[PDB]
């Protein structure tokens, strides 16, 4: 019967609360108990503070009024205020101290997932202090997870005035008995209770979730660790750059700070990075997630040599040039992995740092043809199957759903050995018509990939595999070099195609190479173990790229 | 007969040269004259330095070889090297010292403009030092202005080997007698002379330009001050963000650093900022140049209230949210001006700094209807003409060329008084069918605007003017506030619609307001006086926004 949940910000979705800094300051400075909270509330409905919350005056205009109020409250209680006593100081500090109460955010998230309409209703202020960006950042992180954010200072009303709750109900398109409202201030709860909303007085977070759990009938506490935030494609900024007459590259862009270019693998998409994109933005980076040449909304010219590494790389450089980026951090996976290593070797001036998931760097052997090298590894047999224009295209395009459902599987789920693929006659010859859905992917996510691959199919993606000789020759040019810019190699324990041991010699070529390793992780690193990927990439970025 | 010009980088397009740091170091440290230049050249065709220039080894790999060479050269001349003597030190310093020789760049630019194919041919290195971004930045700024950049370390050949000149000719698709080649090193000139190219030994820049001027027959020296770099639309990164179901915003994006959002006026385009975009990027900013709601590739819903300021502003905020930007600097002109002031007043947490060209901030008068206010100013008569849906649309759409040719004119060029526009019956009733081209705009530039306005015409742009009452009511909500974030107001001396004196009271609302003023500058600020605009905006950004 409950269908909507409404959260306050201070004391509920962010801790510690700013009222708490009034009280602790008093204590810390041994002033009359309550003195600062009296100054804060001075005048009530017609006092400075209400005008703030209603958006009549800015924070900075308020600061000297609160001064005046403290001066008067201390006069009447016959006490002095300390040398250098500063309300700007006290508030700057309070506001940077408050962080997101992670378990309250997680509960809000869970209820939204099961169908609730969620809202933040907060008494707040127009923030124009030199340090405002601090709060701008917090609000940004919170608001994306809610259906509505209602700000006292934007709508010109405040809790506990009754009109804001009517405005609230009217925003939810919900009747008061379909709504739970959590607040840490009981006076603000009263008018929600009068209209007959379920209310929760939030003292400690866990009790409130226990009450919230009871009353909604959904598990909220002790719930397993959730996934990272994923991307909704149609919420993204989509950018497009023509790097040369017949080729434009598409990317999705989120965040500010050092530019970080994500390069997906075969046969994938920018969306392969859907778990990393919000996390790395949040972590203070400008993420550009590409569709690599051949995929999605990027161009897919037909000719094979359009997909040799030399041409691919020159193109990524041109992409930086037209975006006006002198460098970026390049992070790749699978084929996008091989490319970033090559970007490091031929264009180190353009690469802030380089990282690869799964794909090791392995110099070309000048004494052995690349085709020999490939025949030397039973697990690469699929690549010889990929060579004949048309053959693999026909298999892979035949049933896109089945294709992505068969490839994107976790290590304990596979339906396709890479074994004697040529002999068998195809990559799917002995796998089902209608495979089950992997635990890694929802049905909607498979369908996005399917839709992307309707644009150009598999000729462009397959062409990446069809320049063995050209790439070998070009790579041979780099045999005298070492990679000496910052570099990270993440091995995936259960990738049976790019096995971790294939990376074992890499320190000969990259002496200060850094490492991560992910256990129980198959070939589709980013969606198999998103949390562990995010942690390893941010830690490395913050240490080596920042 | 000469059709191509080819420039070296070190000693020609960038000064001072890095060979000069070899010699001056020697002097500064009182070592044997030439000693460092001998170590540098040690081994010749098969020495460390050639392998660098050929791209066999990276800069960082070379550094300790050059060490070894200096050690050996000093041994043979029976002298010691100083305590802390450092080749990394010496080179880091050389490389940051070299800047673009502005007059050589300008000459290259001029020859490209008159039709030459231009190239940089340089002996250079794969740069992997911690400080490489320095050179990446220089190369970026230079290469955009040339048809080809040919790097010894990418093609695996070096001056003076004869094969690089053949590669050069083959890149230009030009015969040697159609080519002038400038170099500061005579040995490198020799093989160009053998093939019969015109060659210029560059010692001091001015003599070389004098020779270059003579031989090409084009003025290059003492030429008037050129325009800033403009944008080629199809070279830009184009981004798109859906801020709500029926509305997506288009912008062009260039550069990295603090995000700077440019908001054009009526009836304009992102392209109104074409002179500011490369300049501010170069100046170290992330420029986002919008098409504002109603224009170009942004959406243009029909309903008037879609263009009230409150809705426009909420939308710009949503644009930040979906891009993951907690703040941006907002810089507006004309209507984009009014908007940024309102962004400052209702969303100061999202605005790093605010600047307006021409548009003053003028609080709403709560005691006077906005229509009264408009009738009170003869020069705003055109705005009453704008009120009736359909009327102004029909005039403005009738002949787009004539429309933009009639509006975009410099102060000494006008063909349209704003005078009694309603009485006259239209904005163009007494101006020509086919106006001349303004000195401010080429024919191609008028045509871009024309093409943009074919998408949605003038209903959306005109609607901005059709919310006088709604904007007044909303603005009245902000009457108690002041703007206390950093703020710049640029007045245009000869803007006869937004006259400078209209800005005279602004310090009452914005006490720390900063100012610029541009003389002899009409309403179309950005294209009338691009250089002076760029200088005022960067100086203000570097001081107040950085
Ligand atoms: C540079 C590189 C060489 C080889 C690489 C691995 N490609 C595997 C793609 C793939 C293909 C088919 C099934 C699963 C699957 F994962 S990357
Ligand atoms: C907030 C604002 C109110 C008025 C403004 C001026 N608009 C002028 C546009 C324009 C229109 C017609 C001709 C020239 C011309 F420049 S901005
Ligand atoms: Mg509270
Ligand atoms: Mg030189």
PDB file of C-alpha atoms in Angstrom, chain A residues 51 54-58 60-61 125-130 132-133 135-137 140 143 151 153-155 234-242 248 251 253-257 281 286 288 310 317 319-327 345-353 477-486, chain B residues 51 54-58 60-61 125-130 132-133 135-137 140 143 151 153-155 234-242 248 251 253-257 281 286 288 310 317 319-327 345-353 477-486:
ATOM      1  CA  UNK A  51      14.382  33.859   5.022  1.00  0.00           C
ATOM      2  CA  UNK A  54      12.835  30.266   1.835  1.00  0.00           C
ATOM      3  CA  UNK A  55      15.446  31.518  -0.657  1.00  0.00           C
ATOM      4  CA  UNK A  56      14.940  35.242   0.090  1.00  0.00           C
ATOM      5  CA  UNK A  57      18.622  35.776   1.018  1.00  0.00           C
ATOM      6  CA  UNK A  58      21.826  33.870   0.182  1.00  0.00           C
ATOM      7  CA  UNK A  60      26.608  34.733   2.530  1.00  0.00           C
ATOM      8  CA  UNK A  61      24.043  37.428   3.261  1.00  0.00           C
ATOM      9  CA  UNK A 125      19.922  27.448   1.390  1.00  0.00           C
ATOM     10  CA  UNK A 126      21.220  29.197  -1.697  1.00  0.00           C
ATOM     11  CA  UNK A 127      24.924  28.535  -1.165  1.00  0.00           C
ATOM     12  CA  UNK A 128      27.259  31.261  -2.504  1.00  0.00           C
ATOM     13  CA  UNK A 129      30.290  30.812  -0.207  1.00  0.00           C
ATOM     14  CA  UNK A 130      33.747  30.495  -1.750  1.00  0.00           C
ATOM     15  CA  UNK A 132      30.003  26.035  -2.159  1.00  0.00           C
ATOM     16  CA  UNK A 133      31.277  23.511  -4.705  1.00  0.00           C
ATOM     17  CA  UNK A 135      27.874  21.023  -1.237  1.00  0.00           C
ATOM     18  CA  UNK A 136      27.206  21.160  -5.025  1.00  0.00           C
ATOM     19  CA  UNK A 137      29.193  17.912  -5.265  1.00  0.00           C
ATOM     20  CA  UNK A 140      24.866  15.936  -7.313  1.00  0.00           C
ATOM     21  CA  UNK A 143      19.956  13.617  -6.418  1.00  0.00           C
ATOM     22  CA  UNK A 151      14.461  22.346  -1.914  1.00  0.00           C
ATOM     23  CA  UNK A 153      14.980  27.577  -0.950  1.00  0.00           C
ATOM     24  CA  UNK A 154      13.695  26.814  -4.525  1.00  0.00           C
ATOM     25  CA  UNK A 155       9.964  26.389  -3.768  1.00  0.00           C
ATOM     26  CA  UNK A 234      19.672   7.958 -22.694  1.00  0.00           C
ATOM     27  CA  UNK A 235      20.806   9.919 -19.634  1.00  0.00           C
ATOM     28  CA  UNK A 236      24.366  10.180 -20.969  1.00  0.00           C
ATOM     29  CA  UNK A 237      26.079  12.995 -22.793  1.00  0.00           C
ATOM     30  CA  UNK A 238      26.862  11.576 -26.202  1.00  0.00           C
ATOM     31  CA  UNK A 239      29.790  13.130 -28.117  1.00  0.00           C
ATOM     32  CA  UNK A 240      30.945  12.661 -31.739  1.00  0.00           C
ATOM     33  CA  UNK A 241      34.195  13.527 -33.409  1.00  0.00           C
ATOM     34  CA  UNK A 242      35.132  13.211 -37.100  1.00  0.00           C
ATOM     35  CA  UNK A 248      33.516   9.588 -36.783  1.00  0.00           C
ATOM     36  CA  UNK A 251      31.808   8.340 -26.932  1.00  0.00           C
ATOM     37  CA  UNK A 253      31.224  11.573 -21.328  1.00  0.00           C
ATOM     38  CA  UNK A 254      30.794  11.963 -17.602  1.00  0.00           C
ATOM     39  CA  UNK A 255      32.668  13.964 -14.927  1.00  0.00           C
ATOM     40  CA  UNK A 256      35.430  16.575 -14.637  1.00  0.00           C
ATOM     41  CA  UNK A 257      39.187  16.368 -13.843  1.00  0.00           C
ATOM     42  CA  UNK A 281      33.481  10.355 -12.470  1.00  0.00           C
ATOM     43  CA  UNK A 286      36.530  13.115 -16.886  1.00  0.00           C
ATOM     44  CA  UNK A 288      35.254   9.355 -22.136  1.00  0.00           C
ATOM     45  CA  UNK A 310      48.709   1.891 -36.575  1.00  0.00           C
ATOM     46  CA  UNK A 317      45.461  10.710 -31.328  1.00  0.00           C
ATOM     47  CA  UNK A 319      40.420  12.328 -31.402  1.00  0.00           C
ATOM     48  CA  UNK A 320      42.508  13.968 -28.679  1.00  0.00           C
ATOM     49  CA  UNK A 321      43.541  16.774 -31.101  1.00  0.00           C
ATOM     50  CA  UNK A 322      39.971  17.606 -32.115  1.00  0.00           C
ATOM     51  CA  UNK A 323      38.802  17.489 -28.466  1.00  0.00           C
ATOM     52  CA  UNK A 324      41.755  19.723 -27.570  1.00  0.00           C
ATOM     53  CA  UNK A 325      43.171  17.190 -25.084  1.00  0.00           C
ATOM     54  CA  UNK A 326      46.970  17.087 -24.883  1.00  0.00           C
ATOM     55  CA  UNK A 327      46.848  13.802 -22.943  1.00  0.00           C
ATOM     56  CA  UNK A 345      54.678   2.826 -27.156  1.00  0.00           C
ATOM     57  CA  UNK A 346      54.156   5.120 -30.143  1.00  0.00           C
ATOM     58  CA  UNK A 347      52.553   8.208 -28.497  1.00  0.00           C
ATOM     59  CA  UNK A 348      53.772   8.422 -24.869  1.00  0.00           C
ATOM     60  CA  UNK A 349      53.449  12.278 -24.948  1.00  0.00           C
ATOM     61  CA  UNK A 350      49.647  11.814 -25.308  1.00  0.00           C
ATOM     62  CA  UNK A 351      49.180   9.176 -22.599  1.00  0.00           C
ATOM     63  CA  UNK A 352      49.000  10.355 -18.961  1.00  0.00           C
ATOM     64  CA  UNK A 353      49.063   6.721 -17.682  1.00  0.00           C
ATOM     65  CA  UNK A 477      59.398  -0.867 -34.912  1.00  0.00           C
ATOM     66  CA  UNK A 478      58.996  -0.636 -31.121  1.00  0.00           C
ATOM     67  CA  UNK A 479      61.267  -3.574 -30.180  1.00  0.00           C
ATOM     68  CA  UNK A 480      63.989  -1.240 -28.860  1.00  0.00           C
ATOM     69  CA  UNK A 481      61.743   0.699 -26.491  1.00  0.00           C
ATOM     70  CA  UNK A 482      60.460   0.262 -22.975  1.00  0.00           C
ATOM     71  CA  UNK A 483      57.223   1.624 -21.479  1.00  0.00           C
ATOM     72  CA  UNK A 484      58.280   4.009 -18.768  1.00  0.00           C
ATOM     73  CA  UNK A 485      55.105   6.020 -18.241  1.00  0.00           C
ATOM     74  CA  UNK A 486      52.814   4.856 -15.394  1.00  0.00           C
TER      75      UNK A 486
ATOM     76  CA  UNK B  51      68.206   6.137 -32.725  1.00  0.00           C
ATOM     77  CA  UNK B  54      64.334   7.524 -35.646  1.00  0.00           C
ATOM     78  CA  UNK B  55      61.979   6.376 -32.865  1.00  0.00           C
ATOM     79  CA  UNK B  56      64.004   3.271 -31.899  1.00  0.00           C
ATOM     80  CA  UNK B  57      64.384   4.390 -28.251  1.00  0.00           C
ATOM     81  CA  UNK B  58      62.399   6.792 -26.039  1.00  0.00           C
ATOM     82  CA  UNK B  60      64.004   8.529 -21.189  1.00  0.00           C
ATOM     83  CA  UNK B  61      66.041   5.619 -22.516  1.00  0.00           C
ATOM     84  CA  UNK B 125      61.712  12.160 -30.168  1.00  0.00           C
ATOM     85  CA  UNK B 126      59.207   9.919 -28.441  1.00  0.00           C
ATOM     86  CA  UNK B 127      58.816  11.930 -25.240  1.00  0.00           C
ATOM     87  CA  UNK B 128      58.070   9.850 -22.110  1.00  0.00           C
ATOM     88  CA  UNK B 129      59.503  12.117 -19.375  1.00  0.00           C
ATOM     89  CA  UNK B 130      57.351  12.964 -16.362  1.00  0.00           C
ATOM     90  CA  UNK B 132      56.151  15.412 -21.524  1.00  0.00           C
ATOM     91  CA  UNK B 133      52.724  17.060 -21.405  1.00  0.00           C
ATOM     92  CA  UNK B 135      55.710  19.378 -25.342  1.00  0.00           C
ATOM     93  CA  UNK B 136      52.370  17.610 -26.072  1.00  0.00           C
ATOM     94  CA  UNK B 137      50.707  20.990 -25.466  1.00  0.00           C
ATOM     95  CA  UNK B 140      48.927  20.480 -30.302  1.00  0.00           C
ATOM     96  CA  UNK B 143      49.858  21.180 -35.681  1.00  0.00           C
ATOM     97  CA  UNK B 151      57.927  13.498 -37.285  1.00  0.00           C
ATOM     98  CA  UNK B 153      60.473   9.515 -34.793  1.00  0.00           C
ATOM     99  CA  UNK B 154      57.140   8.398 -36.423  1.00  0.00           C
ATOM    100  CA  UNK B 155      58.366   7.804 -40.003  1.00  0.00           C
ATOM    101  CA  UNK B 234      32.957  19.843 -38.774  1.00  0.00           C
ATOM    102  CA  UNK B 235      36.241  19.681 -36.854  1.00  0.00           C
ATOM    103  CA  UNK B 236      34.456  20.143 -33.519  1.00  0.00           C
ATOM    104  CA  UNK B 237      33.402  17.595 -30.952  1.00  0.00           C
ATOM    105  CA  UNK B 238      29.633  17.799 -30.908  1.00  0.00           C
ATOM    106  CA  UNK B 239      27.857  16.714 -27.696  1.00  0.00           C
ATOM    107  CA  UNK B 240      24.141  16.141 -26.959  1.00  0.00           C
ATOM    108  CA  UNK B 241      22.303  15.850 -23.697  1.00  0.00           C
ATOM    109  CA  UNK B 242      18.615  15.046 -23.107  1.00  0.00           C
ATOM    110  CA  UNK B 248      17.987  17.755 -25.953  1.00  0.00           C
ATOM    111  CA  UNK B 251      26.991  21.973 -27.582  1.00  0.00           C
ATOM    112  CA  UNK B 253      33.362  21.095 -26.664  1.00  0.00           C
ATOM    113  CA  UNK B 254      37.017  22.018 -26.755  1.00  0.00           C
ATOM    114  CA  UNK B 255      39.826  21.924 -24.152  1.00  0.00           C
ATOM    115  CA  UNK B 256      40.473  20.699 -20.601  1.00  0.00           C
ATOM    116  CA  UNK B 257      40.466  22.433 -17.168  1.00  0.00           C
ATOM    117  CA  UNK B 281      40.747  26.239 -24.654  1.00  0.00           C
ATOM    118  CA  UNK B 286      37.038  23.210 -20.983  1.00  0.00           C
ATOM    119  CA  UNK B 288      31.151  24.055 -23.805  1.00  0.00           C
ATOM    120  CA  UNK B 310      12.889  29.562 -14.785  1.00  0.00           C
ATOM    121  CA  UNK B 317      21.272  22.832 -14.243  1.00  0.00           C
ATOM    122  CA  UNK B 319      22.647  19.722 -18.301  1.00  0.00           C
ATOM    123  CA  UNK B 320      25.340  20.029 -15.635  1.00  0.00           C
ATOM    124  CA  UNK B 321      23.852  17.038 -13.726  1.00  0.00           C
ATOM    125  CA  UNK B 322      23.830  14.743 -16.760  1.00  0.00           C
ATOM    126  CA  UNK B 323      27.378  15.829 -17.729  1.00  0.00           C
ATOM    127  CA  UNK B 324      28.424  15.223 -14.117  1.00  0.00           C
ATOM    128  CA  UNK B 325      29.625  18.820 -13.654  1.00  0.00           C
ATOM    129  CA  UNK B 326      29.098  20.255 -10.169  1.00  0.00           C
ATOM    130  CA  UNK B 327      29.817  23.783 -11.436  1.00  0.00           C
ATOM    131  CA  UNK B 345      20.849  34.296  -8.505  1.00  0.00           C
ATOM    132  CA  UNK B 346      18.945  31.014  -8.252  1.00  0.00           C
ATOM    133  CA  UNK B 347      21.787  28.431  -8.501  1.00  0.00           C
ATOM    134  CA  UNK B 348      24.997  30.020  -7.138  1.00  0.00           C
ATOM    135  CA  UNK B 349      26.271  26.550  -5.987  1.00  0.00           C
ATOM    136  CA  UNK B 350      26.462  25.545  -9.695  1.00  0.00           C
ATOM    137  CA  UNK B 351      28.172  28.689 -11.006  1.00  0.00           C
ATOM    138  CA  UNK B 352      31.964  28.980 -10.572  1.00  0.00           C
ATOM    139  CA  UNK B 353      31.922  32.622 -11.827  1.00  0.00           C
ATOM    140  CA  UNK B 477      11.593  36.143  -5.860  1.00  0.00           C
ATOM    141  CA  UNK B 478      15.250  37.237  -5.984  1.00  0.00           C
ATOM    142  CA  UNK B 479      14.732  40.888  -4.947  1.00  0.00           C
ATOM    143  CA  UNK B 480      16.247  40.278  -1.493  1.00  0.00           C
ATOM    144  CA  UNK B 481      19.489  38.745  -2.740  1.00  0.00           C
ATOM    145  CA  UNK B 482      22.826  40.017  -3.941  1.00  0.00           C
ATOM    146  CA  UNK B 483      25.245  38.323  -6.359  1.00  0.00           C
ATOM    147  CA  UNK B 484      28.362  37.637  -4.366  1.00  0.00           C
ATOM    148  CA  UNK B 485      30.089  35.037  -6.524  1.00  0.00           C
ATOM    149  CA  UNK B 486      32.745  36.349  -8.960  1.00  0.00           C
TER     150      UNK B 486
END
